[PDB]
Design a protein around this motif. Structure first.
Motif, PDB file in Angstrom:
ATOM      1  N   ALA A 136       0.820  -1.208   0.000  1.00 53.27           N
ATOM      2  CA  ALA A 136       0.000   0.000   0.000  1.00 53.27           C
ATOM      3  C   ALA A 136       0.856   1.260   0.000  1.00 53.27           C
ATOM      4  N   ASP A 137       2.068   1.185   0.557  1.00 50.34           N
ATOM      5  CA  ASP A 137       2.921   2.366   0.653  1.00 50.34           C
ATOM      6  C   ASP A 137       3.526   2.731  -0.697  1.00 50.34           C
ATOM      7  N   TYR A 138       4.005   1.737  -1.449  1.00 48.26           N
ATOM      8  CA  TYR A 138       4.535   2.016  -2.779  1.00 48.26           C
ATOM      9  C   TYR A 138       3.454   2.588  -3.689  1.00 48.26           C
ATOM     10  N   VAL A 139       2.237   2.048  -3.605  1.00 47.35           N
ATOM     11  CA  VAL A 139       1.144   2.529  -4.446  1.00 47.35           C
ATOM     12  C   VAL A 139       0.838   3.989  -4.138  1.00 47.35           C
ATOM     13  N   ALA A 140       0.745   4.326  -2.850  1.00 48.53           N
ATOM     14  CA  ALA A 140       0.355   5.678  -2.462  1.00 48.53           C
ATOM     15  C   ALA A 140       1.368   6.710  -2.944  1.00 48.53           C
ATOM     16  N   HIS A 141       2.660   6.386  -2.871  1.00 49.79           N
ATOM     17  CA  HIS A 141       3.675   7.340  -3.300  1.00 49.79           C
ATOM     18  C   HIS A 141       3.857   7.345  -4.811  1.00 49.79           C
ATOM     19  N   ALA A 142       3.569   6.227  -5.479  1.00 51.84           N
ATOM     20  CA  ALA A 142       3.520   6.240  -6.936  1.00 51.84           C
ATOM     21  C   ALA A 142       2.413   7.160  -7.430  1.00 51.84           C
ATOM     22  N   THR A 143       1.257   7.126  -6.766  1.00 55.39           N
ATOM     23  CA  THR A 143       0.145   7.988  -7.153  1.00 55.39           C
ATOM     24  C   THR A 143       0.453   9.453  -6.867  1.00 55.39           C
ATOM     25  N   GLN A 144       1.052   9.741  -5.707  1.00 54.58           N
ATOM     26  CA  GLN A 144       1.413  11.118  -5.386  1.00 54.58           C
ATOM     27  C   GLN A 144       2.456  11.661  -6.353  1.00 54.58           C
ATOM     28  N   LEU A 145       3.321  10.794  -6.881  1.00 56.38           N
ATOM     29  CA  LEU A 145       4.298  11.232  -7.871  1.00 56.38           C
ATOM     30  C   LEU A 145       3.642  11.468  -9.228  1.00 56.38           C
ATOM     31  N   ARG A 146       2.786  10.538  -9.668  1.00 50.02           N
ATOM     32  CA  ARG A 146       2.076  10.729 -10.929  1.00 50.02           C
ATOM     33  C   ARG A 146       1.298  12.037 -10.926  1.00 50.02           C
ATOM     34  N   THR A 147       0.701  12.383  -9.784  1.00 49.89           N
ATOM     35  CA  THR A 147      -0.074  13.614  -9.683  1.00 49.89           C
ATOM     36  C   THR A 147       0.815  14.837  -9.869  1.00 49.89           C
ATOM     37  N   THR A 148       1.981  14.844  -9.219  1.00 55.39           N
ATOM     38  CA  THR A 148       2.894  15.976  -9.353  1.00 55.39           C
ATOM     39  C   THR A 148       3.408  16.099 -10.781  1.00 55.39           C
ATOM     40  N   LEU A 149       3.672  14.967 -11.434  1.00 53.97           N
ATOM     41  CA  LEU A 149       4.172  14.995 -12.802  1.00 53.97           C
ATOM     42  C   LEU A 149       3.097  15.393 -13.804  1.00 53.97           C
ATOM     43  N   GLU A 150       1.822  15.246 -13.451  1.00 53.63           N
ATOM     44  CA  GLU A 150       0.753  15.730 -14.315  1.00 53.63           C
ATOM     45  C   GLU A 150       0.707  17.252 -14.265  1.00 53.63           C
ATOM     46  N   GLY A 151       0.630  17.877 -15.437  1.00 57.02           N
ATOM     47  CA  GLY A 151       0.750  19.315 -15.554  1.00 57.02           C
ATOM     48  C   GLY A 151       2.134  19.805 -15.919  1.00 57.02           C
ATOM     49  N   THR A 152       3.088  18.899 -16.124  1.00 53.05           N
ATOM     50  CA  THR A 152       4.456  19.223 -16.511  1.00 53.05           C
ATOM     51  C   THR A 152       4.760  18.509 -17.824  1.00 53.05           C
ATOM     52  N   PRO A 153       5.875  18.829 -18.503  1.00 52.01           N
ATOM     53  CA  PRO A 153       6.199  18.109 -19.744  1.00 52.01           C
ATOM     54  C   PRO A 153       6.709  16.693 -19.520  1.00 52.01           C
ATOM     55  N   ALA A 154       6.577  16.176 -18.302  1.00 52.25           N
ATOM     56  CA  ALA A 154       7.090  14.848 -17.994  1.00 52.25           C
ATOM     57  C   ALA A 154       6.265  13.771 -18.688  1.00 52.25           C
ATOM     58  N   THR A 155       6.950  12.738 -19.176  1.00 53.90           N
ATOM     59  CA  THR A 155       6.322  11.612 -19.860  1.00 53.90           C
ATOM     60  C   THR A 155       6.898  10.325 -19.292  1.00 53.90           C
ATOM     61  N   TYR A 156       6.031   9.448 -18.787  1.00 47.34           N
ATOM     62  CA  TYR A 156       6.473   8.231 -18.122  1.00 47.34           C
ATOM     63  C   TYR A 156       5.630   7.047 -18.582  1.00 47.34           C
ATOM     64  N   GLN A 157       6.211   5.853 -18.464  1.00 47.47           N
ATOM     65  CA  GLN A 157       5.494   4.630 -18.794  1.00 47.47           C
ATOM     66  C   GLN A 157       4.458   4.308 -17.723  1.00 47.47           C
ATOM     67  N   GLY A 158       3.423   3.573 -18.123  1.00 53.70           N
ATOM     68  CA  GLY A 158       2.323   3.286 -17.225  1.00 53.70           C
ATOM     69  C   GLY A 158       2.112   1.819 -16.907  1.00 53.70           C
ATOM     70  N   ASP A 159       2.705   0.928 -17.706  1.00 53.10           N
ATOM     71  CA  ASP A 159       2.529  -0.503 -17.499  1.00 53.10           C
ATOM     72  C   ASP A 159       3.486  -1.084 -16.466  1.00 53.10           C
ATOM     73  N   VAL A 160       4.574  -0.389 -16.146  1.00 55.59           N
ATOM     74  CA  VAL A 160       5.565  -0.907 -15.210  1.00 55.59           C
ATOM     75  C   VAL A 160       6.289   0.265 -14.563  1.00 55.59           C
ATOM     76  N   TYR A 161       6.634   0.104 -13.289  1.00 60.92           N
ATOM     77  CA  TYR A 161       7.559   1.007 -12.621  1.00 60.92           C
ATOM     78  C   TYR A 161       8.378   0.192 -11.627  1.00 60.92           C
ATOM     79  N   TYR A 162       9.348   0.845 -10.997  1.00 59.73           N
ATOM     80  CA  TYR A 162      10.293   0.173 -10.117  1.00 59.73           C
ATOM     81  C   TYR A 162      10.206   0.729  -8.702  1.00 59.73           C
ATOM     82  N   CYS A 163      10.484  -0.139  -7.732  1.00 60.19           N
ATOM     83  CA  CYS A 163      10.586   0.229  -6.329  1.00 60.19           C
ATOM     84  C   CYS A 163      11.983  -0.105  -5.834  1.00 60.19           C
ATOM     85  N   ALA A 164      12.569   0.808  -5.067  1.00 61.62           N
ATOM     86  CA  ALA A 164      13.944   0.668  -4.607  1.00 61.62           C
ATOM     87  C   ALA A 164      14.010   0.724  -3.086  1.00 61.62           C
TER      88      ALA A 164
END
Ligand code: HEM
Length: 184
Positions: A136-164
Protein backbone atom coordinates in the motif's frame (compact mmCIF):
# COMPACT_ATOMS: atom_id res chain seq x y z
CA UNK A 1 39.96 -2.88 6.63
CA UNK A 2 36.32 -1.93 6.05
CA UNK A 3 33.62 -4.55 6.54
CA UNK A 4 31.22 -3.04 3.97
CA UNK A 5 33.56 -1.08 1.75
CA UNK A 6 32.25 -3.40 -0.98
CA UNK A 7 28.76 -1.85 -0.89
CA UNK A 8 28.58 0.80 -3.62
CA UNK A 9 26.00 3.28 -4.88
CA UNK A 10 24.07 2.83 -8.11
CA UNK A 11 25.73 5.25 -10.58
CA UNK A 12 23.21 7.75 -11.94
CA UNK A 13 23.12 11.43 -12.86
CA UNK A 14 20.63 13.81 -11.24
CA UNK A 15 19.21 15.77 -14.18
CA UNK A 16 16.67 17.83 -12.22
CA UNK A 17 14.82 18.09 -8.93
CA UNK A 18 11.23 19.27 -8.74
CA UNK A 19 8.12 19.40 -6.60
CA UNK A 20 9.27 21.67 -3.73
CA UNK A 21 5.79 21.11 -2.19
CA UNK A 22 4.68 18.01 -0.23
CA UNK A 23 5.96 15.68 -2.97
CA UNK A 24 9.46 16.18 -4.38
CA UNK A 25 11.05 14.22 -7.21
CA UNK A 26 14.46 13.66 -8.78
CA UNK A 27 14.99 12.96 -12.48
CA UNK A 28 17.83 10.44 -12.77
CA UNK A 29 19.60 8.93 -15.77
CA UNK A 30 20.59 5.55 -14.34
CA UNK A 31 23.44 3.52 -15.81
CA UNK A 32 22.75 0.09 -17.24
CA UNK A 33 25.06 -2.91 -17.47
CA UNK A 34 24.79 -6.44 -16.09
CA UNK A 35 22.06 -7.26 -13.57
CA UNK A 36 21.10 -10.22 -11.40
CA UNK A 37 17.34 -10.77 -11.66
CA UNK A 38 14.84 -13.08 -9.96
CA UNK A 39 11.29 -13.35 -11.33
CA UNK A 40 8.46 -14.26 -8.95
CA UNK A 41 4.87 -14.83 -10.06
CA UNK A 42 1.60 -15.80 -8.36
CA UNK A 43 2.69 -14.18 -5.08
CA UNK A 44 2.04 -10.78 -3.47
CA UNK A 45 4.80 -8.19 -3.67
CA UNK A 46 5.37 -8.37 0.09
CA UNK A 47 5.90 -12.15 -0.04
CA UNK A 48 7.73 -12.14 -3.39
CA UNK A 49 10.65 -10.17 -1.94
CA UNK A 50 10.98 -12.63 0.95
CA UNK A 51 11.57 -15.45 -1.57
CA UNK A 52 13.55 -13.59 -4.25
CA UNK A 53 15.95 -11.41 -2.25
CA UNK A 54 17.76 -14.15 -0.24
CA UNK A 55 18.62 -15.81 -3.56
CA UNK A 56 20.26 -12.55 -4.65
CA UNK A 57 22.10 -12.10 -1.36
CA UNK A 58 23.33 -15.70 -1.42
CA UNK A 59 24.70 -15.17 -4.94
CA UNK A 60 26.81 -12.13 -4.03
CA UNK A 61 27.68 -13.96 -0.80
CA UNK A 62 29.67 -16.69 -2.56
CA UNK A 63 26.98 -18.91 -4.16
CA UNK A 64 28.54 -18.69 -7.62
CA UNK A 65 30.87 -20.75 -9.79
CA UNK A 66 33.92 -18.78 -8.65
CA UNK A 67 32.76 -19.02 -5.02
CA UNK A 68 33.69 -15.39 -4.33
CA UNK A 69 31.94 -12.52 -2.61
CA UNK A 70 30.93 -9.61 -4.80
CA UNK A 71 29.78 -6.80 -2.55
CA UNK A 72 26.51 -5.23 -3.62
CA UNK A 73 24.88 -2.14 -5.10
CA UNK A 74 22.32 0.02 -3.32
CA UNK A 75 19.51 0.59 -3.86
CA UNK A 76 18.08 -2.81 -4.76
CA UNK A 77 15.32 -2.16 -7.29
CA UNK A 78 12.47 -4.50 -8.19
CA UNK A 79 9.79 -4.15 -10.86
CA UNK A 80 6.10 -4.06 -9.92
CA UNK A 81 3.22 -4.01 -12.40
CA UNK A 82 0.12 -1.90 -11.62
CA UNK A 83 -3.44 -2.50 -12.72
CA UNK A 84 -5.75 0.33 -13.78
CA UNK A 85 -6.87 0.79 -10.16
CA UNK A 86 -3.27 1.26 -9.01
CA UNK A 87 -3.11 -2.08 -7.19
CA UNK A 88 -0.08 -4.28 -7.84
CA UNK A 89 -0.30 -7.60 -9.64
CA UNK A 90 1.16 -10.72 -8.02
CA UNK A 91 4.19 -10.43 -10.34
CA UNK A 92 7.66 -9.23 -9.32
CA UNK A 93 11.16 -9.11 -10.78
CA UNK A 94 14.27 -8.06 -8.87
CA UNK A 95 16.81 -5.85 -10.69
CA UNK A 96 20.00 -5.99 -8.63
CA UNK A 97 22.84 -4.23 -10.44
CA UNK A 98 26.22 -6.00 -10.47
CA UNK A 99 29.01 -4.05 -8.71
CA UNK A 100 31.21 -2.13 -11.12
CA UNK A 101 34.35 -4.23 -10.63
CA UNK A 102 32.29 -7.29 -11.64
CA UNK A 103 30.45 -5.65 -14.56
CA UNK A 104 33.06 -7.03 -16.98
CA UNK A 105 32.48 -10.76 -16.42
CA UNK A 106 29.95 -11.40 -13.64
CA UNK A 107 30.42 -14.70 -11.79
CA UNK A 108 27.76 -17.18 -12.84
CA UNK A 109 25.01 -17.88 -10.28
CA UNK A 110 24.91 -21.35 -8.77
CA UNK A 111 21.14 -21.04 -8.29
CA UNK A 112 19.44 -21.21 -11.68
CA UNK A 113 16.64 -18.94 -10.45
CA UNK A 114 19.22 -16.13 -10.40
CA UNK A 115 19.77 -15.01 -14.01
CA UNK A 116 22.53 -12.62 -15.05
CA UNK A 117 20.84 -10.32 -17.57
CA UNK A 118 21.88 -7.12 -19.34
CA UNK A 119 19.91 -3.88 -19.63
CA UNK A 120 20.49 -0.43 -21.08
CA UNK A 121 20.51 2.82 -19.15
CA UNK A 122 17.14 4.31 -18.24
CA UNK A 123 15.78 7.62 -16.97
CA UNK A 124 13.49 7.54 -13.93
CA UNK A 125 11.49 10.00 -11.85
CA UNK A 126 12.04 9.16 -8.19
CA UNK A 127 10.21 10.14 -5.01
CA UNK A 128 11.37 9.14 -1.53
CA UNK A 129 9.83 8.14 1.79
CA UNK A 130 10.99 6.43 4.97
CA UNK A 131 9.97 3.55 7.19
CA UNK A 132 9.32 -0.09 6.40
CA UNK A 133 7.49 -0.14 3.07
CA UNK A 134 4.51 -2.34 2.19
CA UNK A 135 2.44 -2.75 -0.97
CA UNK A 136 0.00 0.00 0.00
CA UNK A 137 2.92 2.37 0.65
CA UNK A 138 4.53 2.02 -2.78
CA UNK A 139 1.14 2.53 -4.45
CA UNK A 140 0.36 5.68 -2.46
CA UNK A 141 3.68 7.34 -3.30
CA UNK A 142 3.52 6.24 -6.94
CA UNK A 143 0.15 7.99 -7.15
CA UNK A 144 1.41 11.12 -5.39
CA UNK A 145 4.30 11.23 -7.87
CA UNK A 146 2.08 10.73 -10.93
CA UNK A 147 -0.07 13.61 -9.68
CA UNK A 148 2.89 15.98 -9.35
CA UNK A 149 4.17 15.00 -12.80
CA UNK A 150 0.75 15.73 -14.31
CA UNK A 151 0.75 19.32 -15.55
CA UNK A 152 4.46 19.22 -16.51
CA UNK A 153 6.20 18.11 -19.74
CA UNK A 154 7.09 14.85 -17.99
CA UNK A 155 6.32 11.61 -19.86
CA UNK A 156 6.47 8.23 -18.12
CA UNK A 157 5.49 4.63 -18.79
CA UNK A 158 2.32 3.29 -17.22
CA UNK A 159 2.53 -0.50 -17.50
CA UNK A 160 5.56 -0.91 -15.21
CA UNK A 161 7.56 1.01 -12.62
CA UNK A 162 10.29 0.17 -10.12
CA UNK A 163 10.59 0.23 -6.33
CA UNK A 164 13.94 0.67 -4.61
CA UNK A 165 15.23 -0.02 -1.11
CA UNK A 166 18.49 1.16 0.46
CA UNK A 167 18.47 -0.78 3.73
CA UNK A 168 18.34 -4.44 4.79
CA UNK A 169 15.25 -5.65 6.70
CA UNK A 170 17.33 -5.48 9.90
CA UNK A 171 18.19 -1.74 9.77
CA UNK A 172 15.19 0.16 11.19
CA UNK A 173 16.61 3.66 11.62
CA UNK A 174 16.54 6.18 8.79
CA UNK A 175 15.33 3.86 6.06
CA UNK A 176 14.96 5.09 2.48
CA UNK A 177 12.43 3.80 -0.04
CA UNK A 178 11.90 5.14 -3.54
CA UNK A 179 9.47 4.74 -6.44
CA UNK A 180 10.92 5.06 -9.95
CA UNK A 181 8.67 5.93 -12.89
CA UNK A 182 10.41 4.99 -16.14
CA UNK A 183 10.57 7.95 -18.53
CA UNK A 184 9.41 7.54 -22.13
C1 HEM B 1 13.28 -8.63 2.39
C2 HEM B 1 14.29 -8.75 1.53
C3 HEM B 1 15.59 -9.27 1.99
C4 HEM B 1 15.87 -10.52 2.45
C5 HEM B 1 14.89 -11.66 2.61
C6 HEM B 1 17.25 -10.55 2.76
C7 HEM B 1 17.86 -11.70 3.26
C8 HEM B 1 19.23 -11.80 3.41
C9 HEM B 1 19.94 -13.00 3.57
C10 HEM B 1 19.34 -14.38 3.65
C11 HEM B 1 21.26 -12.68 3.67
C12 HEM B 1 22.40 -13.65 3.85
C13 HEM B 1 22.80 -14.16 2.46
C14 HEM B 1 23.93 -15.16 2.54
O1 HEM B 1 25.12 -14.76 2.57
O2 HEM B 1 23.68 -16.38 2.58
C15 HEM B 1 21.37 -11.29 3.56
C16 HEM B 1 22.56 -10.61 3.61
C17 HEM B 1 22.62 -9.24 3.42
N1 HEM B 1 21.63 -8.40 3.07
FE1 HEM B 1 19.85 -8.88 2.79
N2 HEM B 1 17.82 -9.36 2.50
C18 HEM B 1 16.87 -8.53 2.02
C19 HEM B 1 16.98 -7.21 1.60
C20 HEM B 1 18.14 -6.47 1.74
C21 HEM B 1 18.29 -5.12 1.40
C22 HEM B 1 17.20 -4.25 0.82
C23 HEM B 1 19.59 -4.76 1.69
C24 HEM B 1 20.20 -3.43 1.51
C25 HEM B 1 20.37 -2.94 0.29
C26 HEM B 1 20.24 -5.92 2.22
C27 HEM B 1 21.54 -5.97 2.63
C28 HEM B 1 22.16 -7.17 2.97
C29 HEM B 1 23.60 -7.22 3.28
C30 HEM B 1 24.56 -6.06 3.28
C31 HEM B 1 23.89 -8.50 3.54
C32 HEM B 1 25.24 -9.04 3.93
C33 HEM B 1 25.79 -10.05 2.93
C34 HEM B 1 26.72 -10.96 3.68
O3 HEM B 1 27.01 -10.71 4.88
O4 HEM B 1 27.21 -11.95 3.10
N3 HEM B 1 19.34 -6.95 2.19
N4 HEM B 1 20.13 -10.77 3.32
Amino acid sequence: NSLFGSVETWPWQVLSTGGKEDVSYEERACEGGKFATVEVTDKPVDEALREAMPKIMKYVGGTNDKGVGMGMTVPVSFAVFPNEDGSLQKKLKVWFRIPNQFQGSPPAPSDESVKIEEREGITVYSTQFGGYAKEADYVAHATQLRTTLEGTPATYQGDVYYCAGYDPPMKPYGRRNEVWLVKA
